[PDB]
Amino acid sequence: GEEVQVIIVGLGIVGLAAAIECREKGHSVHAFEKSNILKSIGDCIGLQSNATRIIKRWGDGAVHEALRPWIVSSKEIRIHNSSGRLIIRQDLSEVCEQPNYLLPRSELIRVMYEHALKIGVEISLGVEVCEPSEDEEGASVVALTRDGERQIVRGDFIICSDGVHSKMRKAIMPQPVEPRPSGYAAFRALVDTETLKGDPEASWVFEGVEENDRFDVFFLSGAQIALQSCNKGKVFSWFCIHQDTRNLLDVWTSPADPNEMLDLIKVWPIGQRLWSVIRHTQPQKFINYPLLNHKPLDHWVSSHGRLILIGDAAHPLSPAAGQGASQGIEDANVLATSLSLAGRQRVSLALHVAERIRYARASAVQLISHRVNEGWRNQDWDAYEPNEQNIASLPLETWIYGHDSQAYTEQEFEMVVRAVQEGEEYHATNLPDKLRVQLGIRNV
Numbered sequence: 403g404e405e406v407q408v409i410i411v412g413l414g415i416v417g418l419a420a421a422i423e424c425r426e427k428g429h430s431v432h433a434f435e436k437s438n439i440l441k442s443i444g445d446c447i448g449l450q451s452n453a454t455r456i457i458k459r460w461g462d463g464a465v466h467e468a469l470r471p472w473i474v475s476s477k478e479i480r481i482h483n484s485s486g487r488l489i490i491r492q493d494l495s496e497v498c499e500q501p502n503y504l505l506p507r508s509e510l511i512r513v514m515y516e517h518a519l520k521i522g523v524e525i526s527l528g529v530e531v532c533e534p535s536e537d538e539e540g541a542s543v544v545a546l547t548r549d550g551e552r553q554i555v556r557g558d559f560i561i562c563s564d565g566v567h568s569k570m571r572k573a574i575m576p577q578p579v580e581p582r583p584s585g586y587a588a589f590r591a592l593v594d595t596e597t598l599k600g601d602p603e604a605s606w607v608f609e610g611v612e613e614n615d616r617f618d619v620f621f622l623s624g625a626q627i628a629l630q631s632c633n634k635g636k637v638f639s640w641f642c643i644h645q646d647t648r649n650l651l652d653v654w655t656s657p658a659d660p661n662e663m664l665d666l667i668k669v670w671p672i673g674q675r676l677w678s679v680i681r682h683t684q685p686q687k688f689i690n691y692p693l694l695n696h697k698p699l700d701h702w703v704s705s706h707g708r709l710i711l712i713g714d715a716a717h718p719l720s721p722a723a724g725q726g727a728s729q730g731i732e733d734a735n736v737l738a739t740s741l742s743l744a745g746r747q748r749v750s751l752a753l754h755v756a757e758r759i760r761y762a763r764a765s766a767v768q769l770i771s772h773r774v775n776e777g778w779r780n781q782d783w784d785a786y787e788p789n790e791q792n793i794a795s796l797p798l799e800t801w802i803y804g805h806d807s808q809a810y811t812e813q814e815f816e817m818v819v820r821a822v823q824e825g826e827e828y829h830a831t832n833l834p835d836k837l838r839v840q841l842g843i844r845n846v
């Protein structure tokens with residue numbers, strides 16, 4: 403008569419999604435997080451329809467109602483050259499037939515955090531989780547507080563949602579593999595809306611944004627730039643993918659030099675117009691984030707089946723991919739659904755089933771994303787004009803964004819159980835079959 407006791411390590415987007423999914427499906431959750439996750443840091447996150455389909459179920463629609471102001475209203479991507487001439491309008495009608503969100507990461511965290519608290523997730527901030535262990539009966543972690551005190555916490559299993567720099571990862575893969583730099587990085591930030599509104603030279607950027615979010619892309623030699631708005635022009639954000647061979651750390655806090663962006667764009671005709679908006683970025687908010695290529699891990703689940711890596715701890719993707727957060731939300735949904743179908747007496751089975759459902763699909767998205775990091779889509783802009791050939795297509799793939807991970811898990815659960823228990827390979831159909839072999843994905 404006792405609920406499953408889930409421990410969650412890390413309350414980024416994925417840990418919060420896992421906490422909500424598990425709690426809404428009738429499991430007890432104690433989540434731990436080392437930092438004040440409500441602090442304003444980073445820029446905007448996109449959530450595609452594969453993630454919003456999951457979010458819509460939470461609280462009988464309550465979270466979707468809270469996120470309604472952030473539904474993407476762009477009907478097209480406007481693709482421009484280095485003169486700012488519009489070359490192509492790329493239709494988003496299919497991509498946006500179901501909701502997508504774009505919003506500051508800090509606002510998404512706030513909404514999810516408040517819902518988690520409302521539904522009875524137990525949350526402990528200021529806790530660095532250390533030293534996971536497990537056996538056939540249970541798992542435990544050490545909760546280290548800032549006073550140096552150590553508290554043992556026991557549960558049925560541990561969700562390791564501790565991000566790209568996961569220290570839990572070594573409990574599954576003890577040998578760490580460094581990612582390869584792509585040679586590219588992304589300048590990116592939110593624009594200060596207040597100083598933006600006060601600048602007559604930037605007023606053009608507000609045109610139409612109350613009815614359709616801005617989604618402008620500009621291709622210049624050495625730059626892929628996007629300007630976006632969300633929530634009827636309350637928020638503007640931008641990024642610029644550019645060549646960079648410096649030894650940049652993949653964190654969201656390091657100082658970056660705005661004049662590097664100005665130098666890159668000012669030499670092209672459209673540069674001054676782009677800078678009229680971009681210059682309103684606050685100086686300590688200018689981030690230059692390296693686009694690193696991480697290889698799929700061999701597997702995500704520990705030897706006794708009571709620890710699982712999800713989110714960026716398992717499959718980090720660069721922010722240029724568009725599917726990073728959404729794939730992590732799929733992890734949370736598949737894991738919670740698998741746990742609910744397996745039950746408390748079959749925890750290792752639940753985690754291994756979730757891994758077999760998720761691994762190939764997540765790895766395909768990860769491996770494809772290495773292409774946008776390496777600039778495969780760029781051409782010589784002295785000769786070519788940009789068009790749909792140059793837009794990375796992960797956000798446009800129906801096999802990704804149209805997928806219902808919960809329905810797939812319910813329909814396939816017993817077949818995956820059979821594969822796990824008979825020691826056979828499970829061939830998931832939640833990615834195109836030609837993609838496995840083409841990308842070299844090896845099933846777990």
Ligand SMILES: Cc1cc2nc3c(=O)[nH]c(=O)nc-3n(C[C@H](O)[C@H](O)[C@H](O)COP(=O)(O)OP(=O)(O)OC[C@H]3O[C@@H](n4cnc5c(N)ncnc54)[C@H](O)[C@@H]3O)c2cc1C
Nearest residue numbers: 412414415416435436444445446531564565654713714721
């Ligand atoms: C500060 C920050 C800002 C970001 N801004 C953006 C952005 O603007 N755009 C974008 O596309 N992506 C951004 N990202 C990345 C994005 O959040 C992730 O790619 C994605 O949302 C899902 O990652 P995740 O939830 O698995 O991990 P993360 O979001 O990285 O969250 C991991 C969490 O685990 C916590 N943690 C780590 N180790 C421990 C431990 N031992 N004990 C307890 N807690 C621990 C961390 O404090 C963190 O809160 C940002 C990430 C961070 C950390």
Ligand SMILES: CC1(C)c2[nH]c3cc(Br)ccc3c2C[C@@]23CN4CCC[C@]4(C[C@@H]12)C(=O)N3
Nearest residue numbers: 474497502619626628722723724793794797
């Ligand atoms: C993640 C991005 C920003 C994105 N985000 C979307 C959201 C929706 Br609803 C529809 C399409 C997209 C897309 C395609 C996008 C547009 N961007 C233009 C230069 C880099 C990049 C990243 C990538 C690209 O090549 N394709």
